[PDB]
Structure formats: structure tokens, C-alpha cells
Amino acid sequence: RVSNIHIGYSFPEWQIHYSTGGPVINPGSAFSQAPWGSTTEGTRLTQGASEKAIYDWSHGDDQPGARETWWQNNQHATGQTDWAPKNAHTSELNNNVPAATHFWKNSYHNTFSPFTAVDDHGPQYPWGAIWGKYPDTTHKPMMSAHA
Amino acid sequence: GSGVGHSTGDYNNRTEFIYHGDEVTIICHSTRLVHINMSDREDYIIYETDRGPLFPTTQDLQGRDTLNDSYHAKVETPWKLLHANSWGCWFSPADFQQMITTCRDIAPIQMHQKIENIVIKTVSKTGTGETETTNYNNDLTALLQIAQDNSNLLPWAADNFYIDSVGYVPWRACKLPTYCYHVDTWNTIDINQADTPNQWREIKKGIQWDNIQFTPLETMINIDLLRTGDAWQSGNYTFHTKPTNLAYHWQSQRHTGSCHPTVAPLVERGQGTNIQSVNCWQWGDRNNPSSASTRVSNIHIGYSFPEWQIHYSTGGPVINPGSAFSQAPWGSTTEGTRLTQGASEKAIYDWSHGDDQPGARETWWQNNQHATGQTDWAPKNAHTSELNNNVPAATHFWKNSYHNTFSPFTAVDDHGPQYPWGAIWGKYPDTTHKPMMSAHAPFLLHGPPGQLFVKLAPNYTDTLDNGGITHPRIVTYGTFWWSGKLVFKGKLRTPRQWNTYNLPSLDKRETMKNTVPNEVGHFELPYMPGRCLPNYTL
Amino acid sequence: DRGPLFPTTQDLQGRDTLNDSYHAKVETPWKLLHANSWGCWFSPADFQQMITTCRDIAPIQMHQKIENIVIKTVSKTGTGETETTNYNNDLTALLQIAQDNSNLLPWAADNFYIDSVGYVPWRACKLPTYCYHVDTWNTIDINQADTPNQWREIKKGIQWDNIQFTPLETMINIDLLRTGDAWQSGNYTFHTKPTNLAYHWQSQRHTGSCHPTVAPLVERGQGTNIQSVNCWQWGDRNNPSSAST
Amino acid sequence: SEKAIYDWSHGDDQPGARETWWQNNQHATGQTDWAPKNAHTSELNNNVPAATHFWKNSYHNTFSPFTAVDDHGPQYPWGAIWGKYPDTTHKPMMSAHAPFLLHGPPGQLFVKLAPNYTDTLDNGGITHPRIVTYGTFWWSGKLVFKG
Amino acid sequence: GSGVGHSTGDYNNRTEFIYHGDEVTIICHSTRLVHINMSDREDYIIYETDRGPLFPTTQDLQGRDTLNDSYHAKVETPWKLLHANSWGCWFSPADFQQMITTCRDIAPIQMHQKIENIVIKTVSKTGTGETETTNYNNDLTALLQIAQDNSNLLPWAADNFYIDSVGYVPWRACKLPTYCYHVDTWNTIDINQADTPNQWREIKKGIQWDNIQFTPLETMINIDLLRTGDAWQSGNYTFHTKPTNLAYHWQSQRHTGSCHPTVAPLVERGQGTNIQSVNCWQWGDRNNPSSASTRVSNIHIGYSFPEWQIHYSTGGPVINPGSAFSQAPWGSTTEGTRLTQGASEKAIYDWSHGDDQPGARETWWQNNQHATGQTDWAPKNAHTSELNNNVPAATHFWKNSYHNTFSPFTAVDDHGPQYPWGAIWGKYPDTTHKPMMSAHAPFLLHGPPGQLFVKLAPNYTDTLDNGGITHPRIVTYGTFWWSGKLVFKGKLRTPRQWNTYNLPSLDKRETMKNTVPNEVGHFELPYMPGRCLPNYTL
């Protein structure tokens, strides 16, 4: 049914950009893999632009001389979850059900469009950065991937 | 005076066009009689739904059939929702033609609305058997209760996406849809599986109860109780938005800018020749040939998108729309082969909304046929590795791909207003990134016009026991008169060309006699696009 | 016509169809004069002066003039071999000038064909003729269901029903000038943003805090990345914690 | 990358021929992202991906809300200084050639010689000869920049 | 400054639409380049003319062929006449569409005009044989002489009935017709004779010399001599007239008033039945049946006239027009059988006026096809002696008569404006009884806009002898730029109906591509009627 906007967008993930400085990750949008069966214990699905913090005794860690890891799947954001292997597209949208041909299951594409409403990570305690810096470029980013 | 026997309002449904230099002010009046009856229950309820019709129970279509899922979970309220959001509510067919002929762009300015001439009465069946007699007699002391939600505390259900609104025809009575809104539920269908391909399976299905949000209207907003002699005023509402363009754009990326230098033809019906060697900016490392196909440009008009993109979300599968464009250049026609590819859309509507006969639903499929400059259809595009004087090889050329070419350079354009059935306005989501443009309603609002809820207060019998088991109530219905005024402003249109235009008419699929009433009074409102006249983009 | 090097055959199976210049225009008797280009306003040393000494720049205001108008006619009396031509003034003759301020006419001065006033100040210049596109469908199908590795044209031609034809005479006021009078543009003020005159060399791995390392002890020695550090990593990954992720 | 084709009237050495200058944009190395060289993998964790779950050769559009990017900038001699926005609901975010996009661009200036007819113009349309005429005028302009 | 090398004017040809509430102000600018050359002679002359082509020299068609007489007698003057009277002069096709779409009625308000940028030059042929060379070189001292006739002392020749006016296309050069006017002559042809029937004979033919009136312009009005550096102003002219209605009327005498009482149909596609016994005013002594055919009415719409009425006058045979109406209800069609009966008219026009190709003349026959309410065609009417409950006998009924039913009761309606070629205004005759309405031009004026005369002063050689035999003069021609501004005012039109209109377009006989220029630049202006939209009369 028609709608004015779309919530979320697929992105090739994890996108490895080989740049002039070296390979990097190009992030996708933040979302929870919980609707798809992800859990901290058991099978972990990293797909949601999840991130891990590595920290030591000086920053919020229990014992000296070791580093502790906290992996945050962003588990409360379930409305934004769009994961490209699960999406499909068909050629014609009508009263007929598509054929085996004219249906494409497995593609990875970037659906970010003028219609997409999306949402960022937000503040992460303790370890998240509060602020960040814009680059000076003709096109500034629309939103931040961490801070 | 005021009381039982004095009328609280009058009937005004008519439009006004105020012309001053380079400015048009349209004042739309709409008055409708609304037939309301007692709620199915006095309680809020929350329930899951079935999948829907034509959802697969088997693997035989191997998942391609799962687009049919309507499954969801809602909280249904005793309240009814009354909104005017649609074009056919405010305009008659001749008023909308007047607007789209004489105006360049338009925006809504301010709005207010009223409810008055409230009548409530009860049904008493004394028939006691065959040849049964019913009596309809007033309850002078009885309450219609009205709640306007100004601060938008309640979830937004009035988007006109189910075309449930006040009627289009002024002299007919109307009925309101029941208000209800979604609750959090996971619906995740896996059509692509590692172990077992060509299968579909549901991973997580059900209501998520832990964080569920349940909001009654009683706790959120003040409710006004009205009797037969008093009336209700909305107050003024002011839109904050941008005008929408009433002209369609025919120019593609090769219809804009300076055209390639040519040698004019000497005779009649002769064609010019492109000069081979010219000064040009070319893309890539290419001088030969320097052609209009490859030359630099500041912008690009249109973008490809995977279409139709089926997004399997936490709530279920959805369509992720592409840009609106006409498939006519590729041979699409309403009759014959239909190409749905342009982000086309169909309206389903009934006798209450612009339909000819009662008891049936009519369908209007709009291919957006005037927008031919924006048309970009991914199977037809290609890409090559090197752009130079050489023609690419079989390798280094990719024909069939589906990609999203939306970039910083793309200039694109929306659907625009659709008469009768299109929504006038819509609501932004609150997210860090707001959408750049709307896929249906021409105007997205941060605060949209407040939602207006209407309900009949219950009339109990004498047997209410406080225990909960027996709370009968006497059958009751009511009617009230809804008035509203919406003001638009726009820019006056003047001829930019020598030759005559094609002024907005009736789509070839419609004829004039089906627009006017019948021997029995049946007629349907015609379709008109909000953009019926061409103009230059750049 | 299509243009040079457009395929007439299927031998290159559609890959050759990028060469299409086909279009449809309305050509006007008017000539177009614009200064839009960098080489018009700056000399090579002036542009070097600017890009050396400035961070960013934007245009502010502009005006222009036309004057010292001379019009004359050609008279060939030669009547055969050893032909003589005479160039003599018409004192009463008109140059007509139209400035389009409200942008009612289609926009043809983009400098994409590099047709502009000359770059060299001491040389004479000639203007391109003004013309603009009309609505036409050109749709080539290089990807077909029935017959692959083919190309076919679906819709080709001018769309006459809604066509727009705008003369300058009806849209804008035209000024007629004789040899003694001159023409002024009036002032024009740009509204825009500055553009940055510095290029950026930093990639996504040249920005931000660099990975912690152990500095080299000797000359031409290279530092070593510390294996275990505090970091924010993408995904569920501590090992290795690298500048890549 | 883009190439300019220009003649003696515009910055060219010899008359009667056209010269070509291909500009690879060679100073902008930080922005370089070339799709055949990028890759994406399914899971990002301490494990190295398998042969499956790694996709080398794809071509996708990674433009996202997070991307900071940068345009061509001014090109001497031949680059356009300004350009025109299209009127559409979504205006482009940045220009692919001219450094400055304008809503109203500088007005277009049109020039024509009025016709000088002979005495034989017949009003019928068949014969309207006109005497061969040419002209010269001097164009002056002043453009002000600030930076 | 001013002199040889300074231009005296600028080119403005464009229209402006000023909208204020219920009022429209249209300001039309028109500027044209006029090519003028030396007069055929510097003297006035007076001469008779031949009959014309296809006039009978024999009795074989027994007089029916004598309608072809063009015979007359004129006084031809060296002056040329320049008038803007026509619709196609002031409006472009899109401007006229804008007007007739958005306005109810309109009238011209004020007008002024100019002449400037005067160039005069001479032709010198030195070729002296084959391969001849001509030189075109300025005479800086030479005179264009201009005479505006404000008081209307000269006979009125600018009626645009020969469609000789300033050109319709702004970018093309124009040429003026020579001014000349009739002198008194008797032409009387007798097609009905007592002695010898089925013959034709001329009684009195020739110029009547005794009372003849000969008026030069030199004696009547002041003449302005202009050189290349000076320019000419008209002064302001103000029209005094009434607006003309831009809506056509479809209602006949049986489409007006209260309709006969009927019983509505119960089903779909059923038709109602007229109630047999009703209260009515009937004509005559008649109650049975009381039918919509016979019932009283205050007025009558339309009148029959003998048509085509050929009036044999003292000047020759003429057509006496009937009222304008459509023959479409009777089965007339442009293709197929054409019925000319409605006071229809044809325009003959050339490349200079709205025609596609040079060297040929194109014809447009306008049946007035939107006016169907006024249609009264005498062969179809009948009359009977008694009007009562009895049906008339074979006697007392007259079928085939041709009579003029114009009466005090008749309401009738004129042609209205015809684009491009119709005259805007006309001139009243001075007679004791002025006509009630016009047969062509929408506006009849007492003082019409003054006639403007233009002439090149003669350039003699040195051989002028004062004896009259030798007065050679050097071949000279000129060009000047004519500017004018005509202001119109009218009433804004608003929708009176629910359903959409048919907005003014292009006649089925025209297509859009013939309106726009060609590969070689050939195009023709489309026909539009000034009344393209319906409205209720009474």
C-alpha cells in the first residue's frame, strides 16, 4: 500500500572499501538483528552495523592488566532493520504472482533513496564519544555513524 | 437564542477564487452530514490478525507468494476518526480544473472546522413478531463526545491511505472509519535460506509484550461532551510547508542545456546533420565522436532503483518505492501491455468516494503518464569500464544490472496531487534523518493537522451491575453536520509559449456523461492529475 | 540524424549505441553571448595569483555593456574575374539586443560546448547561434527478452501534442540600437556559497586518531602497531583491532 | 574524468585544428573509491571470511547518509563558472561540473542584426531578398569575486 | 541624443494579463517592421472596373450567374493604409486562448501607436548589361509623410474585410494596402422582367458624375513630414462601446424556462413520462394536449430570414445577412454535406496572414458550430391558421415558406470575435436608424480609431519640366517600425457547474504541429472562436 516515506535502507554489508590509505569499512545503518534470531549468547549476527568496545582498567574495566570487550548489538532498534540478503525484487507488481524468472532473491543493493527515514546509534555509555568533527567538503554528511 | 429547538449552524459547501496580481487565493468550504452509531464495544481491545487472503500455506510457489502478507497487530478503540485529508473532499471536478489550469504552484495555508446540529436518537422495536414496528425517537439528554488531538500525542492513523475520509459528494451522508493503531510485533519471513533453498520460513512471529505501548484517548487529551443544543469549534490551524509545482516536466537529461551544433536542413521534411568536429566537454578520455550522449552536465535527472523492491522488515514485507515516471516512452499503454515500473499506483474506491454504483469497488490505475523526463528503468541501463574513443568489448560491458543510481547529482520529482483520492498532507517521522521528499502526499508536515475523534457516549439500561458481566445499553445512533474551510495560496500562471496549450480535460479512459448524475443518480468523479501542463525544467 | 559512428548493424550487438547524438531543436536567428568560463575573465597569471593566495572564492556581482556598434554592407561590383568588393557603412541600421532577466527562455548557456567569448583579449570573437531542445522520445532497447545481443529502437520522434515553442519576441523586450547609441546590462548579484580552492588528500584511513604504535629506534626503521589497544571496532571483533576496522 | 575539445578561439595553439586536454583529477586522492576493487563480507568478527560469504567483483552505489564527498572545482581555462538548478522537488546536492549552481542564473543575452531588405519584398512570402550585412561591436563586462 | 545615428524606438511585442478581483486587464503590445516603396504614381486617379471573373456574358444560366458582379468605381490614392484591426495582430495563439478561457466578456479600452526607426534608401543599377549590379544606399535627407485622420473626414476603408492589415507574425516584415474608396455609381441588373422572363438585363450602369465627391487627403488633414532621425506619436484614443460575451448559448426556445412536469424513471436508462393533465399557459385556444411545444413565453430566441438574400441595389447585388447559427443539429458537418445556411462565412488568407506556405491562399470556412440555440431555418418552419385542440388540415398548413420572423419579441445573438482574421471593431453609418447589432465586427463605433495613412515623398531627378510630360523620379523604398498598444478589460470567469468544462483547444480540422514552425519555418495560426465555452441564456 502506498506510504509517504520508507523506514530503513539496505546497504552492502560489510562493505570493505579499498581506499588510497588502505581497506576500510563503509558502515550501514544501525539496527537490531534480534527479529532475525540474533542473541548475545548463541548465534551472533553482526549485521546491524554493530560495534565492539575494547577497554582497560583505566576505562570502566574490572581488573588491571587485561582488556575487556563489550559487543553492542543495537538491540532496541527493531524498526529500522533492513538486511539485504533477505529482501527481494520483482519486475511487475500486479494481481499475478511473479514467476521463477522475474524474481531476484539474493541481491545486495543500496536502497537509500529520497524517501528513506533512518536513525543513528545515539549515545553509548560509558565509552561512546559525545561529539565529532565535520570534514570540510562540498557535501557534508547527513548524519553521524558514531558520535 | 439557544436550546433544543434552535439550529447551531448552516450549510456552506462552495469554493472561492481570489485573484490579485501574480497571486491566487482559493478558499474551499466543505460541509457534510455524518451518520454515526454506537460503538461495537465500550472497551479498548488488542488482537492479532490472520495473514490474509492468498497468503501461501505451502511451498509450491517457493516463497514468491509471500508478498500477500497483511498480518499485523492493533489496538482498536471505540472512537471513530474524521479527517478531510483528500483532494476530492475540498474540490469539485470543475474547481480542481480551475486550479490546475490557472496556477503554477500551490500550498495550503490555514484550516478550521466545526461540528454542529447534533441529533441523537434511539431505536425501540415493539413489533413483538412478524410485521414488526420500530420507533426512532429523540434523546434530548444524550452526549456526543469529541476529542481533537492538537499536540499529536496519539499515533497517526489519518493518512488517507485506505481512502477512508469524509465523502466526496456534498449532498450524500457519510460514515467514519474506526480509529486503531499498530502495536509492536515481529513478522520475519525468510525466503532466502542457506540450508534449504526455494523455501520460505517464518522466524519470529507474534506480539512483543515487554515494551508494548497502550495509549487511551481518555488519559492523553481533553474530551468535550456535547448535547443536542451546543456546538463545537476547532480553532485555527496554520500549515508550515512549501508549494508544490503544478507543471509536469518532460525534459530528460538529453533535453536540457545547450544542444549539439547541427547544420539546418535546406528543404522541407529534411533533417539536420550533427557537425562532427565541435568544441565540447566530454566525459572520460574521449574526443571521437563528441556526441550529445557523452558530454558533461552539472546535474542528472532521475535515478534507477531496484524495482519492485520488496523489503522484508520486522513487521513484514513492504514495497520500497522508486521514483515516479511514465512508462509510455517504452511502449506502455493502459489498454494492451501495461508496464507498472514507474512507481505506479492504483486506487480502490467505493460509492462513498467517487464511484458510480453502490455495492461494488472500482479501480483506477494511474501510470504517471505525463512525467517522461524522469524515466530511468534499471534493466535498460548499462555500464562500461572505460569511456574513450574505443567501443567497449563484450566483456567490460554490463547490460542487465539493477542498481540504485541516486547520487548527490540527481534531480528528481515527486507524484504531486492526485484528484480525487490523493492525500493532501502527510506526517514526517521523527528520526535523525528526515526524508527528502514524499512518495505520495504532496505536503509533509511536522505537526500535521490534529486528529479529530468522535464517539457516542453509552446509554445504559437499568441493569448495569458493576460486576462486569451485564452492561446492556440501548441502541443509539446520531447524526451531526461537519463543516470545514481550507485556504490555499499559489502563483498565477501565464503563457510561456506561442502555440496554444492542451488545457486540462478528462482522461481518455473517462467520458463526460459518466461524470454527471444518472437516471437513478449514479455518477463518479473523474481523475485529474495535479500537474496537467508542461513546463521547462532548467 | 543519429550522428557519426552510430551503429547501422547488429555486429557490435548494441555496445556501439552510446554514440547517439539524435535530438530535435528549435533554431532561432539570435546569437548567444555569454562570459561563462574561467578563461574569459582571467589571464594565466591572474588565475595563478588567485589560486595561490586564496582559500575559497565566490562570485559577487556582475554587469556588462555593448557599445561602439558598427554595421556595414557588402557590395560586389566586380562583374566577373578580378572582382571588387566594397565595404561601406549603413549609418541607419539596427543591432537588436535582448537580455532575458527573468529566465523565461530555456537555458542554453552552460558552456558545455565551450562556445563563449574568446579567451584572448586582442582577438575578435564570434557567437554561437541560440537554439534549444523540443520534446522528443528516443528509446533504444539493448536488453531484450526474446532476442538477446540485439538493439532496437522503440519510440523515436518528435512529440507534437504538447510541444512548446517560445520566440524571444513574445517573451522579452528587445532593444534596437543604431551606430551612435550604446547598451547597459544593469547590475546582477550572485547568491551562492564559496568553493574550496584546496584539494583533499586524506582518505578514510588518513583521518582521525591514528593507531597506537611503537616508534622506531634507528634511522629508516619503521614502527610497530601495538597488538592490544583500546579501540572501537566494527562488528563483533577484538582480534586484531586494526586501523582498517 | 573529463576531456575538453577546444579550438584557436579558445586557448588553442594553431588555427584550423582542435586540441584535446584530458584531465584526470590527479590531486584528489582521498576520495578515490572504485567499485571493482571493493569487497563485502557477511560477518565481521575475529574469523577470516570463507570463500563463500565474500563478494569481490560487485558494482554498487555506496552513497549513504554518512558519505562526505567533494566536487571537481574550477577548471581553467575552459570550465564553466556557474550553472543553473532545475526546478524539481529535489534539487541536486552538488554540481558535477560548474562550481556554482544558481537558481536564477545571470540572464541570457541575445544579439541579432535587424534585416535590411531590398526593394523587392512582395508580402507574398516567396521573394524577400536582403542585402548582405555584417557588424562589429565591443562587449565589456566586469565580474567581482570575493574570498 | 538625436540624429542620423541614434535609434528612435525599441521593439516590444508581448501581452500582459492583470488580474484583480472579478476584473481582467489585458495589455497587448505589437511591433511590426513595414516595408514601403514609392507610389505607383503621385496623382489621384478615378476609374471604372470590369465586372469580374465568372460574370455571365450570355443568357444561358438565365440570370442566376449574376451574383458574381464585382463592378464598381473608385478613386485610388498614392497613400497606403495601415491599420491593426484584426485579432491576430494583437494576440498570439496562446494569448487568445488565455483570454477566452479566463474571461466572461471583454471590451477594448484605449489605444495608441507609434512610427519610428525610419529608413529610406534608393536603388542604383550600374550593371549596364548582363551580370548587373545594384546598389542600395541611404538618402539621409528624404521624407516619409504620415497622416492620421482623427475626425474621420475621409471615407472609411479600414474594415479588415479584405484581411489587409499588419501581419500576424511578429518577426516577419509587412506591406500595406493602397487606400482607395468608392465613388457614386449606378449598377442595376434586372433578373425579373415582365416582358421576357428568365433573362437578365442591366438598366443603369456607370459613374454618376453630377454630384460626385472627390476628397484628397492634402486638403482635409494635416500631414507630417519625417526624416530618418525624427519619430511619430499617435496620441491616445479611447473606445466607447459595450463588452461582448465570450460564452456561446446552446439553449433554444424549448431549453429555457420551467420544464414540463414529468414522472421520473424508476430504473436505469429509463425515460420519464410527461404528465398529461397539468396547469399551463397555452397559446391559442388549446388545452389538449398541453405540451412544451405550445406554451407561452416572454421572448423568442432566433428569427428566420430569407436566406441567402440577394439584394440588387444601386451599386449591385449584395447579400443581406441572416442571424448566425449552427447547422449541426440538422446534420451539417465540415466533411461530408455542408449546410451554409447559418450566415456562415469563409476567410481567404495568405502567407502574411496566418498561412502555411508562400505563394498560395488558404481558405477557412467557419460554420458557427457552437451556437445551436439560435438556429432557425425558414424551409423547416411551418404555420397554421388555427391553434386549438384540433390538428390542422392539409389546407390551413403552410410548410415551405421563407419569411422574416424578426419581431419585438426576438432575442438573438451575433458572431462574436473570430481569431485570427476577424475584425475587432467597425464603424456605424450615420443614418436616422442605426443598426441594432453587427454582422461581423464585435464592436461598432461612432468615431472609430482614426485612419493612418503613410506615403513616401517623391524624389525627382533633375529633369522635371513643369510642363507635365516629364517628371521622372528616382526609385526609392523605405522601412519603418510600427508599434502599438491596445488595452482590453473584462470580467473574470468562475465555474458555474459541478462537472469539468471542455477548455478551448484546437478545431478538429487543425493539428498542433501545423501551428509551430517547420523545417523551413512555415506555420499557420490556428482558428479559435471568441466564444468557446457554454453558458445559460436565461
Author numbering:
A (entry chain P): 326 to 472
B (entry chain D), E (entry chain M): 32 to 569
C (entry chain N): 81 to 325
D (entry chain N): 375 to 521
Original authors' sentences:
The capsid also protects the genome enroute to the nucleus for uncoating and replication. The VP ORF encodes two overlapping structural proteins, VP1 and VP2, sixty copies of which assemble the T = 1 icosahedral capsid in an approximate 1:10 ratio, respectively. The individual VPs contain an eight-stranded (βB to βI) anti-parallel β-barrel motif, with the βBIDG sheet forming the interior surface of the capsid.
In 2016, CuV was found in human fecal samples and cutaneous T-cell lymphomas (CTCL). In the CuV capsid, the depression at the 2-fold (blue to cyan colors, corresponding to a distance of <110 Å from the center of the capsid) is broad, continuous, and has a slight diagonal tilt relative to the icosahedral 2-fold axes. While CuV’s VR1 is extended compared to MVMp due to a five amino acid insertion, VR3 is one amino acid shorter and adopts a different conformation. The absence of this loop separates the 3-fold protrusions in the CuV capsid while the loop merges the 3-fold protrusions in MVMp as well as protoparvoviruses CPV, FPV, PPV, H1-PV, and LuIII, which all share this loop. In contrast, CuV possesses a lysine in the same position (K377), which is similar to the CPV variant (R377K) unable to bind SIA. Thus, while TuV might bind SIA in a similar way to MVM or CPV, CuV’s SIA binding is likely different due to sequence and structural variability in the capsid’s surface loops.
